[PDB]
Amino acid sequence: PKPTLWAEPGSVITQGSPVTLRCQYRLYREKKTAPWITRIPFPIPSITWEHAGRYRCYYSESSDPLELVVTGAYIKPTLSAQPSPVVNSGGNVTLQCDSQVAFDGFILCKEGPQCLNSQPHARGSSRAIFSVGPVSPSRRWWYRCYAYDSNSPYEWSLPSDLLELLVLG
Amino acid sequence: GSHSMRYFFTSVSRPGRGEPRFIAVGYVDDTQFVRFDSDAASQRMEPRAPWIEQEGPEYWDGETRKVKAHSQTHRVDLGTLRGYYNQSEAGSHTVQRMYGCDVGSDWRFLRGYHQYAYDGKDYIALKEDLRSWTAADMAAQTTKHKWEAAHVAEQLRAYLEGTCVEWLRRYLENGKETLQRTDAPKTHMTHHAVSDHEATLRCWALSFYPAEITLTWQRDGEDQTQDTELVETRPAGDGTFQKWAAVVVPSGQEQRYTCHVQHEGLPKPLTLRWEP
Amino acid sequence: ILKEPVHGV
Amino acid sequence: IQRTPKIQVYSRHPAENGKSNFLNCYVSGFHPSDIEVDLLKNGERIEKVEHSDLSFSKDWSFYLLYYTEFTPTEKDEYACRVNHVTLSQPKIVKWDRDM
């Protein structure tokens, strides 16, 4: 009787912040063991990178994967709008996420979160380009981006500052 | 087999808190033999192998003078480069330099090299022929002008094919017991439960020298290239190196897996079976 | 041994 | 362009609870070279930790070995604390007896 596995508040949590994996036991982590589980009497008081990973749950066939992501490990990237963050209604714009740290993984998240994943724009650039729109003055178009290493895809950087598109009515 | 000598230099600027930190280090193959730290109290080129320790005060006096000269030129280089890319006075910057010689199995010169970096990106490299430069930049070409004008390439090829390889050979004989002899890896396998259905098999290689090694997992003879995680070869602290390789495996199937080990110190390639 | 002399960039 | 350190915490010799050994923290692949590395014993900084001399690999990124002699126990927890300009805050890597 296949159980369920979610996380409270969610599955994308900033380092040092709390999270509880709830299942409806023997929780485990894919690839590498997670010793924090074998010290529960499933709450984590303050999430570190140690907790990041793919988790399943059984007691039945094992549940759907929960990808527990830890953010804030690295310094943040810079997100910019190209050529401009001001755009005419119905228009598209290119969003540019630059990390000063060498990373090959980039995540663009829209707030007010739905996130898009991407590789770098060139061989060894540490910069991703995204296309968004068409945009509209009736809705808000607010974004942040993360950078990560594809070898440890569950540990993300601090997010960039918020980028707001200004959409001209 | 083939041997090499290489020298590595790193200077890093320190806005406000005085002169740049200069560190130099010399290697024969995978063994460190000299060092210089501009922040140490000795202010001297220091030995880091018993076999170089036998060199007399002439060696230590002379080497110290040359590494001090290396220190000074790199100190100025920092200022020069901060100009070339018109960067501000804030922020620390880094210049790096690597050069040395490779000898074949015969102990005769094979290849020489001399590279330079600024803030961790390639800056200028001496080509293979030892007579021309790859100035793969814009400001690096300003450095290429000065250096083919001053005949740096001419006197580098003289160093590299000459005193580099001659002193390497002296080092190879003096450190015979350390540099010409190998440590074969001590190997073993460990097992780690992941779930009721899956488990990790890890293949260990320990106390080996030199660092070059290949560890692969095979299932039923077929290589598991995609599914093998390899850590970076790492130093033990005692002159030897370590490495391991792991694969996630379905429980009940461990017996199908073999670890395979290639290293100089082994007279033939090892095949470790989980279940012989 | 080190090379002698060395040049600035 | 900066690079965040890869971090490995291991022992020099196969670990055995009675037997004196060396705890190693190898940081590699980083840029720039300034780096703060401490070995911790039950969360407290160990005095007089040594390190190797700064060197670097083909791609110009640096590596250092930080080490001290130790005697592992079934209770004593060892860790490596690393801080670097590519990190938002110090990263702690626990010594795992089999990585």
Side-chain angles (χ1 to χ4, degrees):
Chain A
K2 192 195 174 78
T4 182
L5 175 52
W6 75 90
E8 268 185 279
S11 58
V12 175
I13 304 295
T14 70
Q15 67 173 212
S17 178
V19 60
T20 305
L21 308 191
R22 284 170 82 186
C23 193
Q24 186 173 355
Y25 304 133
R26 293 182 183 174
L27 186 79
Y28 72 101
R29 177 169 69 168
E30 289 182 14
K31 292 297 285 183
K32 168 176 194 178
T33 317
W36 71 272
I37 304 164
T38 60
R39 296 198 298 276
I40 305 304
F42 307 93
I44 298 162
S46 76
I47 199 165
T48 61
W49 70 275
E50 272 158 23
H51 305 91
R54 247 212 250 197
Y55 289 83
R56 302 266 202 170
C57 191
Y58 70 85
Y59 78 124
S60 67
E61 60 168 339
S62 51
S63 69
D64 290 325
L66 179 77
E67 299 188 329
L68 193 62
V69 170
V70 186
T71 73
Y74 313 97
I75 63 178
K76 65 189 184 188
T78 285
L79 183 44
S80 80
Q82 227 65 43
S84 173
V86 324
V87 293
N88 311 327
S89 182
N92 298 324
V93 65
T94 295
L95 302 188
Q96 176 173 304
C97 185
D98 292 293
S99 168
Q100 71 194 58
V101 187
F103 282 124
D104 67 330
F106 296 83
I107 311 290
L108 177 68
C109 292
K110 203 167 85 177
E111 305 193 349
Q114 154 197 73
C115 308
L116 196 57
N117 179 46
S118 177
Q119 67 169 14
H121 89 302
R123 182 173 179 170
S125 75
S126 295
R127 168 196 286 191
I129 294 169
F130 297 91
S131 64
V132 288
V135 301
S136 291
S138 63
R139 195 151 49 183
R140 50 165 78 157
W141 301 81
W142 290 10
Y143 296 91
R144 283 181 196 261
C145 73
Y146 299 79
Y148 69 98
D149 186 343
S150 70
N151 294 321
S152 37
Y154 307 118
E155 296 158 63
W156 296 354
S157 66
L158 279 165
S160 70
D161 294 347
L162 189 62
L163 180 78
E164 302 163 31
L165 301 185
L166 180 65
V167 190
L168 294 323
Chain B
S2 295
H3 296 265
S4 75
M5 189 168 65
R6 297 196 204 86
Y7 282 95
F8 298 81
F9 307 94
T10 299
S11 201
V12 44
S13 73
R14 292 188 276 192
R17 297 183 196 170
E19 66 194 53
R21 173 63 164 271
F22 185 68
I23 295 159
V25 63
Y27 278 92
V28 177
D29 299 318
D30 292 317
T31 308
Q32 202 197 324
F33 74 100
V34 286
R35 79 142 207 173
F36 178 84
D37 188 333
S38 67
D39 275 4
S42 75
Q43 296 295 305
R44 232 77 76 183
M45 183 79 104
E46 302 181 28
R48 285 302 197 102
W51 49 271
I52 208 74
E53 214 156 45
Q54 74 182 245
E55 298 294 353
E58 318 77 53
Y59 188 89
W60 300 118
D61 184 68
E63 243 35 27
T64 304
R65 294 183 181 277
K66 296 192 280 176
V67 78
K68 279 168 156 76
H70 277 66
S71 189
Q72 186 48 47
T73 56
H74 281 90
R75 173 180 200 180
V76 168
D77 291 348
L78 284 160
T80 301
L81 295 174
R82 190 173 43 82
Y84 285 164
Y85 295 97
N86 55 255
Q87 299 165 85
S88 70
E89 294 186 24
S92 179
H93 290 99
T94 310
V95 296
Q96 284 162 274
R97 191 194 214 102
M98 186 274 285
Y99 63 75
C101 40
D102 290 355
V103 300
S105 37
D106 56 8
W107 284 25
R108 291 193 297 274
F109 177 90
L110 189 52
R111 191 167 190 275
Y113 33 72
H114 175 286
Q115 311 195 260
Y116 197 106
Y118 182 49
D119 294 325
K121 169 181 181 298
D122 284 316
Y123 187 73
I124 183 164
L126 180 60
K127 300 194 173 159
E128 304 177 331
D129 54 27
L130 295 174
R131 291 193 297 274
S132 52
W133 303 90
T134 300
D137 198 67
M138 296 297 103
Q141 311 193 31
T142 303
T143 302
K144 190 188 171 174
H145 170 70
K146 296 183 179 190
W147 280 8
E148 70 206 335
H151 290 84
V152 177
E154 284 307 352
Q155 67 191 56
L156 265 176
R157 77 170 287 172
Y159 169 76
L160 293 170
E161 295 168 321
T163 55
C164 191
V165 176
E166 294 155 33
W167 282 84
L168 172 48
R169 286 193 287 256
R170 179 208 183 84
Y171 300 155
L172 292 172
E173 200 67 40
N174 281 30
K176 183 185 289 72
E177 188 77 354
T178 305
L179 304 168
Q180 292 183 66
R181 289 270 298 272
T182 67
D183 278 310
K186 302 197 219 300
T187 64
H188 79 277
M189 288 149 93
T190 55
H191 187 280
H192 299 95
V194 174
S195 67
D196 180 299
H197 291 304
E198 284 189 314
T200 299
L201 291 173
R202 178 170 291 114
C203 188
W204 290 84
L206 297 173
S207 309
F208 56 90
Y209 180 97
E212 167 59 11
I213 192 157
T214 309
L215 301 182
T216 57
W217 276 103
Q218 285 171 215
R219 180 195 198 195
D220 298 318
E222 178 178 304
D223 301 71
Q224 304 298 296
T225 324
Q226 279 186 148
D227 304 324
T228 306
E229 180 199 335
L230 297 163
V231 288
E232 187 194 330
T233 305
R234 66 205 194 181
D238 63 351
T240 64
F241 297 88
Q242 311 184 344
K243 193 183 199 67
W244 59 254
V247 296
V248 182
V249 163
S251 297
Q253 289 174 52
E254 287 85 356
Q255 69 270 20
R256 291 163 66 178
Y257 290 80
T258 53
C259 179
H260 306 252
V261 189
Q262 298 172 277
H263 183 274
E264 270 177 54
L266 295 168
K268 299 177 173 179
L270 270 169
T271 303
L272 300 197
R273 301 181 57 62
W274 171 255
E275 183 174 295
Chain C
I1 59 162
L2 298 170
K3 80 156 313 171
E4 188 170 26
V6 64
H7 298 266
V9 299
Chain D
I1 193 82
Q2 309 183 307
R3 297 198 169 89
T4 203
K6 293 179 179 179
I7 315 176
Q8 293 200 65
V9 191
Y10 52 110
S11 64
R12 179 182 296 186
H13 302 299
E16 179 178 321
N17 284 304
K19 199 169 169 188
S20 289
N21 202 334
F22 290 87
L23 180 60
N24 290 331
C25 187
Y26 183 59
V27 287
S28 56
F30 61 101
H31 218 290
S33 67
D34 291 315
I35 198 168
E36 308 192 322
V37 181
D38 279 313
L39 300 182
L40 314 181
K41 151 105 174 292
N42 300 307
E44 296 195 316
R45 186 182 164 282
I46 302 174
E47 302 279 278
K48 298 180 176 60
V49 181
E50 301 210 321
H51 57 87
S52 58
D53 298 319
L54 188 62
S55 195
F56 52 86
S57 314
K58 188 58 174 303
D59 74 350
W60 307 102
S61 63
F62 300 97
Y63 58 88
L64 285 171
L65 182 67
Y66 283 70
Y67 60 105
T68 193
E69 15 217 321
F70 82 138
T71 314
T73 310
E74 270 304 45
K75 292 175 193 187
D76 289 303
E77 289 203 73
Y78 290 90
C80 185
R81 196 211 293 139
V82 180
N83 199 17
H84 189 246
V85 294
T86 61
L87 294 169
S88 47
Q89 49 176 294
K91 188 182 191 184
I92 308 169
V93 181
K94 294 187 163 75
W95 174 50
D96 188 335
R97 269 183 293 183
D98 43 55
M99 282 101 263

mmCIF file of all heavy atoms in Angstrom, chain B residues 7 63 66 77 97 146-147 156 159, chain C:
data_model
loop_
_atom_site.group_PDB
_atom_site.id
_atom_site.type_symbol
_atom_site.label_atom_id
_atom_site.label_comp_id
_atom_site.label_asym_id
_atom_site.label_seq_id
_atom_site.Cartn_x
_atom_site.Cartn_y
_atom_site.Cartn_z
ATOM 1 N N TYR B 7 58.309 23.252 -10.605
ATOM 2 C CA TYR B 7 58.259 24.290 -9.583
ATOM 3 C C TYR B 7 56.967 25.086 -9.720
ATOM 4 O O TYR B 7 56.536 25.366 -10.821
ATOM 5 C CB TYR B 7 59.441 25.231 -9.730
ATOM 6 C CG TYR B 7 60.733 24.704 -9.209
ATOM 7 C CD1 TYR B 7 61.641 24.080 -10.050
ATOM 8 C CD2 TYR B 7 61.068 24.862 -7.875
ATOM 9 C CE1 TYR B 7 62.860 23.606 -9.567
ATOM 10 C CE2 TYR B 7 62.280 24.408 -7.378
ATOM 11 C CZ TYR B 7 63.175 23.776 -8.231
ATOM 12 O OH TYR B 7 64.374 23.316 -7.728
ATOM 13 N N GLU B 63 69.941 28.946 -3.726
ATOM 14 C CA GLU B 63 68.517 28.755 -3.971
ATOM 15 C C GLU B 63 67.691 29.855 -3.312
ATOM 16 O O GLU B 63 66.709 30.332 -3.879
ATOM 17 C CB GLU B 63 68.064 27.383 -3.466
ATOM 18 C CG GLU B 63 67.549 26.458 -4.556
ATOM 19 C CD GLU B 63 68.297 26.627 -5.864
ATOM 20 O OE1 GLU B 63 69.478 27.032 -5.828
ATOM 21 O OE2 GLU B 63 67.704 26.353 -6.929
ATOM 22 N N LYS B 66 67.724 33.044 -5.408
ATOM 23 C CA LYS B 66 66.896 32.912 -6.613
ATOM 24 C C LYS B 66 65.395 32.927 -6.306
ATOM 25 O O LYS B 66 64.621 33.535 -7.045
ATOM 26 C CB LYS B 66 67.275 31.652 -7.393
ATOM 27 C CG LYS B 66 68.698 31.702 -7.921
ATOM 28 C CD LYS B 66 68.991 30.601 -8.926
ATOM 29 C CE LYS B 66 69.273 29.287 -8.246
ATOM 30 N NZ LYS B 66 69.457 28.219 -9.257
ATOM 31 N N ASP B 77 54.855 42.022 -10.591
ATOM 32 C CA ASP B 77 53.832 41.451 -11.475
ATOM 33 C C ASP B 77 52.417 41.722 -10.975
ATOM 34 O O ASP B 77 51.565 42.131 -11.745
ATOM 35 C CB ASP B 77 54.013 39.934 -11.650
ATOM 36 C CG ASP B 77 55.263 39.562 -12.445
ATOM 37 O OD1 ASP B 77 55.877 40.466 -13.056
ATOM 38 O OD2 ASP B 77 55.629 38.359 -12.455
ATOM 39 N N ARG B 97 52.725 30.684 -11.242
ATOM 40 C CA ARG B 97 53.706 30.264 -12.243
ATOM 41 C C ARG B 97 54.115 28.819 -12.016
ATOM 42 O O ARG B 97 54.348 28.407 -10.885
ATOM 43 C CB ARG B 97 54.938 31.146 -12.140
ATOM 44 C CG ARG B 97 55.972 31.048 -13.269
ATOM 45 C CD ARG B 97 57.270 31.735 -12.828
ATOM 46 N NE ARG B 97 58.030 32.421 -13.890
ATOM 47 C CZ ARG B 97 58.069 33.739 -14.128
ATOM 48 N NH1 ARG B 97 57.409 34.621 -13.384
ATOM 49 N NH2 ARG B 97 58.810 34.192 -15.132
ATOM 50 N N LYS B 146 57.624 41.846 -24.591
ATOM 51 C CA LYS B 146 58.770 41.977 -23.673
ATOM 52 C C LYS B 146 59.680 40.733 -23.644
ATOM 53 O O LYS B 146 60.904 40.869 -23.561
ATOM 54 C CB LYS B 146 58.308 42.236 -22.226
ATOM 55 C CG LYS B 146 57.551 43.528 -21.945
ATOM 56 C CD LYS B 146 57.259 43.636 -20.450
ATOM 57 C CE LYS B 146 56.529 44.921 -20.078
ATOM 58 N NZ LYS B 146 56.460 45.145 -18.603
ATOM 59 N N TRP B 147 59.076 39.539 -23.709
ATOM 60 C CA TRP B 147 59.770 38.271 -23.422
ATOM 61 C C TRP B 147 60.498 37.653 -24.620
ATOM 62 O O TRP B 147 61.544 37.007 -24.450
ATOM 63 C CB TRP B 147 58.782 37.252 -22.804
ATOM 64 C CG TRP B 147 58.507 37.452 -21.322
ATOM 65 C CD1 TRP B 147 58.902 38.502 -20.540
ATOM 66 C CD2 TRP B 147 57.749 36.584 -20.464
ATOM 67 N NE1 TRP B 147 58.453 38.333 -19.253
ATOM 68 C CE2 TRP B 147 57.742 37.167 -19.178
ATOM 69 C CE3 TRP B 147 57.085 35.367 -20.655
ATOM 70 C CZ2 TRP B 147 57.103 36.571 -18.087
ATOM 71 C CZ3 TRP B 147 56.445 34.779 -19.568
ATOM 72 C CH2 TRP B 147 56.465 35.381 -18.299
ATOM 73 N N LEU B 156 65.101 30.112 -21.408
ATOM 74 C CA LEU B 156 64.243 29.071 -20.823
ATOM 75 C C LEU B 156 64.552 27.691 -21.403
ATOM 76 O O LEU B 156 64.720 26.731 -20.644
ATOM 77 C CB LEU B 156 62.745 29.374 -21.001
ATOM 78 C CG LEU B 156 62.032 30.083 -19.850
ATOM 79 C CD1 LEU B 156 60.594 30.386 -20.243
ATOM 80 C CD2 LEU B 156 62.057 29.260 -18.571
ATOM 81 N N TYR B 159 67.651 26.499 -19.875
ATOM 82 C CA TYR B 159 67.389 25.984 -18.520
ATOM 83 C C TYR B 159 66.737 24.598 -18.590
ATOM 84 O O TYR B 159 67.270 23.614 -18.052
ATOM 85 C CB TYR B 159 66.489 26.943 -17.722
ATOM 86 C CG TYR B 159 65.960 26.365 -16.415
ATOM 87 C CD1 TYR B 159 66.787 26.259 -15.290
ATOM 88 C CD2 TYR B 159 64.635 25.913 -16.303
ATOM 89 C CE1 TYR B 159 66.313 25.731 -14.091
ATOM 90 C CE2 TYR B 159 64.151 25.384 -15.110
ATOM 91 C CZ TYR B 159 64.994 25.292 -14.008
ATOM 92 O OH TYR B 159 64.530 24.776 -12.826
ATOM 93 N N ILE C 1 66.914 22.473 -9.454
ATOM 94 C CA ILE C 1 67.201 23.886 -9.052
ATOM 95 C C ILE C 1 66.351 24.875 -9.839
ATOM 96 O O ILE C 1 65.928 24.589 -10.959
ATOM 97 C CB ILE C 1 68.705 24.270 -9.192
ATOM 98 C CG1 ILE C 1 69.235 24.110 -10.623
ATOM 99 C CG2 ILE C 1 69.544 23.475 -8.205
ATOM 100 C CD1 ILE C 1 70.525 24.869 -10.866
ATOM 101 N N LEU C 2 66.125 26.040 -9.242
ATOM 102 C CA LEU C 2 65.419 27.146 -9.903
ATOM 103 C C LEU C 2 66.192 27.688 -11.117
ATOM 104 O O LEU C 2 67.429 27.600 -11.161
ATOM 105 C CB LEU C 2 65.185 28.291 -8.908
ATOM 106 C CG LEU C 2 64.315 27.999 -7.682
ATOM 107 C CD1 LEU C 2 64.373 29.146 -6.691
ATOM 108 C CD2 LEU C 2 62.883 27.742 -8.104
ATOM 109 N N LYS C 3 65.451 28.284 -12.045
ATOM 110 C CA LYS C 3 66.035 29.006 -13.159
ATOM 111 C C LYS C 3 66.483 30.387 -12.692
ATOM 112 O O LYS C 3 65.925 30.957 -11.753
ATOM 113 C CB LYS C 3 65.028 29.136 -14.304
ATOM 114 C CG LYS C 3 64.008 30.247 -14.110
ATOM 115 C CD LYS C 3 63.452 30.722 -15.443
ATOM 116 C CE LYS C 3 64.562 30.958 -16.453
ATOM 117 N NZ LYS C 3 64.026 31.220 -17.817
ATOM 118 N N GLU C 4 67.499 30.910 -13.363
ATOM 119 C CA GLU C 4 68.104 32.200 -13.046
ATOM 120 C C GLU C 4 68.373 32.876 -14.386
ATOM 121 O O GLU C 4 68.846 32.196 -15.297
ATOM 122 C CB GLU C 4 69.422 31.990 -12.277
ATOM 123 C CG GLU C 4 70.048 33.266 -11.725
ATOM 124 C CD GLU C 4 71.214 33.039 -10.764
ATOM 125 O OE1 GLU C 4 71.895 31.989 -10.851
ATOM 126 O OE2 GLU C 4 71.450 33.933 -9.915
ATOM 127 N N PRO C 5 68.037 34.158 -14.572
ATOM 128 C CA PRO C 5 67.153 34.948 -13.717
ATOM 129 C C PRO C 5 65.704 34.765 -14.161
ATOM 130 O O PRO C 5 65.415 33.961 -15.058
ATOM 131 C CB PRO C 5 67.623 36.382 -13.986
ATOM 132 C CG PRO C 5 68.020 36.350 -15.424
ATOM 133 C CD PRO C 5 68.605 34.979 -15.661
ATOM 134 N N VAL C 6 64.817 35.526 -13.540
ATOM 135 C CA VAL C 6 63.391 35.480 -13.825
ATOM 136 C C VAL C 6 62.923 36.892 -14.193
ATOM 137 O O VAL C 6 63.461 37.885 -13.681
ATOM 138 C CB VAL C 6 62.602 34.899 -12.621
ATOM 139 C CG1 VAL C 6 62.709 35.790 -11.387
ATOM 140 C CG2 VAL C 6 61.143 34.664 -12.982
ATOM 141 N N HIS C 7 61.922 36.966 -15.072
ATOM 142 C CA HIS C 7 61.444 38.225 -15.630
ATOM 143 C C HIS C 7 60.048 38.573 -15.153
ATOM 144 O O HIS C 7 59.215 37.691 -14.916
ATOM 145 C CB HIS C 7 61.449 38.140 -17.148
ATOM 146 C CG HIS C 7 62.811 37.917 -17.712
ATOM 147 N ND1 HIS C 7 63.623 38.954 -18.125
ATOM 148 C CD2 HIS C 7 63.526 36.784 -17.887
ATOM 149 C CE1 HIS C 7 64.773 38.464 -18.552
ATOM 150 N NE2 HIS C 7 64.739 37.150 -18.419
ATOM 151 N N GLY C 8 59.806 39.875 -15.010
ATOM 152 C CA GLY C 8 58.480 40.398 -14.745
ATOM 153 C C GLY C 8 57.625 40.333 -15.997
ATOM 154 O O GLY C 8 58.127 40.131 -17.105
ATOM 155 N N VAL C 9 56.323 40.490 -15.818
ATOM 156 C CA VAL C 9 55.388 40.505 -16.943
ATOM 157 C C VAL C 9 55.131 41.952 -17.381
ATOM 158 O O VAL C 9 55.606 42.887 -16.732
ATOM 159 C CB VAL C 9 54.069 39.779 -16.615
ATOM 160 C CG1 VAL C 9 54.343 38.324 -16.281
ATOM 161 C CG2 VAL C 9 53.304 40.463 -15.490
#
